[PDB]
Amino acid sequence: EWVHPQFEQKA
Amino acid sequence: EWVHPQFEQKA
Amino acid sequence: EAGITGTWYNQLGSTFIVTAGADGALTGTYESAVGNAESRYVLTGRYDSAPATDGSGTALGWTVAWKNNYRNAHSATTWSGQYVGGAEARINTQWLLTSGTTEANAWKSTLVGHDTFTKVKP
Amino acid sequence: EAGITGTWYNQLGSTFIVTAGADGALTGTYESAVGNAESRYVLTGRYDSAPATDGSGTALGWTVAWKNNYRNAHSATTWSGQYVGGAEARINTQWLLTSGTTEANAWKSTLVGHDTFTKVKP
C-alpha cells in the first residue's frame, strides 16, 4: 500500500 | 469513487 | 435560552437534530445529505450550559462514529466549535475525522476540515 | 544567533537541512527516511528573526511541495511551530498535508499531524 513521501521508510 | 458518509451526496 | 436544541444544516446538505440537556449533554442524530435511514448516525457531545453573558458564543463539541445498523466506515468525526445566537444563529465548527488504520497507514489517519451550521437549509 | 540553521531530524527518519537568513527566510531541503536523491524536496518558509527575549520560542513555518525531478505526489505540507533553544534544542510543529483533489473528493484533501525535530537523530 502506497505511503506518501513525507512518511515513506526504507524497504 | 467512494465518498465517506459524512460527505456523501444525493445522486 | 441555550438556543441549541433543534435542527441544524451544514453547507453540504447534512442535517443534525440535537437536544441540549440542562446538564450540558448533547444527544441526537446526524444524517448525511443522502437523507435515508442508512445515512443516519448517533451524535453525542457536550456544551457549556452556563455561557458568558458578554456577547461570547457558547462552546460545544460532539462526536459521530460512522457505524449504524446498516454500514460501518470504521471512523469517527469530532466537531469542535461554538454556537453564536442572534438573528441568524449559527454553529461554527472545525472537525477531525479519524479512520482506524494500521500503524504503517497512521500518517493518513486524520483528516481536518470545517463546517458552518444554520437553522435554515443552504 | 537564531539557532535554526543546520540539520534537523524528526522522530520517524526524515531529515531537513535549512539556512535561516538574516531577513527571516528559511531555505533548504527536506529528505524522507528513504534518503536518496528521489527522496529530497525543496523547503521554503519564514521565521521570526527578532524573537522575544523572555524565554519564549521562535515562531516559524515552512512548506514542502512533494514534487522533485523524480516524483510527484500532487500535494504539499506546511509545518507551523516554534524553535525552542537550550541544551537539547527542538522545533515543535503541527502540519497540514493538502493533496490536489476534485471537488467531489475535497473532503479527503487535508491531513493533519505533528512532528518534533531535534539536532540529533532518534
Numbering used by the authors:
A (entry chain L), B (entry chain D): 1 to 11
C (entry chain A), D (entry chain K): 14 to 135
Task: Recite the paper's sentences.
As a proof of concept, we used this platform to identify both known and novel L- and D-amino acid peptide binders to the well-characterized model target, streptavidin. All peptides bind within or near the biotin binding pocket of streptavidin formed by two surface loops [1/2 (amino acids 22–28) and 3/4 (amino acids 42–52)], and by antiparallel β-sheets involved in an extensive polar interaction network, in which residues Ser88 and Thr90 of β-strand 6 play a major role. The surface loops of streptavidin are flexible: upon biotin binding they undergo a conformational change to form a closed conformation, but to accommodate the peptide ligands, loop 3/4 is dislocated by 13–16 Å from the biotin closed form to adopt a well-defined peptide-specific structure. All eight L- and D-peptides discovered in this work bind to the same pocket of streptavidin in distinctive binding modes suggesting (1) the rich malleability of L- and D-peptides and (2) the ability of streptavidin itself to adjust the flexible loop to accommodate multiple peptides with diverse sequences and conformations.
Most selected sequences (1,019 of 1,100) contained HP, PQ, or PM sequences: their presence would be expected in the well-known HPQ and HPM streptavidin binders. Binding conformation of EWVHPQFEQKAK peptide closely resembles previously published HPQ peptide-streptavidin structures. The HPQFE amino acids at positions 4–8, occupy the biotin-binding pocket of streptavidin and adopt a rigid conformation, whereas the N- and C-terminal amino acids are exposed to the solvent and show significant degree of freedom in the crystal structure [Fig. 4(B)]. The His4 and Gln6 sidechains of the HPQ motif form hydrogen bonds with residues Ser88 and Thr90 of streptavidin. Pro5 is crucial for positioning the Gln6 sidechain within hydrogen bonding distance of Thr90. The sidechain of Phe7 is involved in critical π-π stacking against Trp120 from a neighboring streptavidin subunit. To explain why “secondary” binders that exhibit higher affinity to streptavidin than the commonly reported HPQ-motif binders have not been previously selected in random libraries, we assumed that the HPQ(M) motif contributes most of the binding energy, whereas the contribution of the flanking sequences is relatively minor and multiple flanking sequences are acceptable.
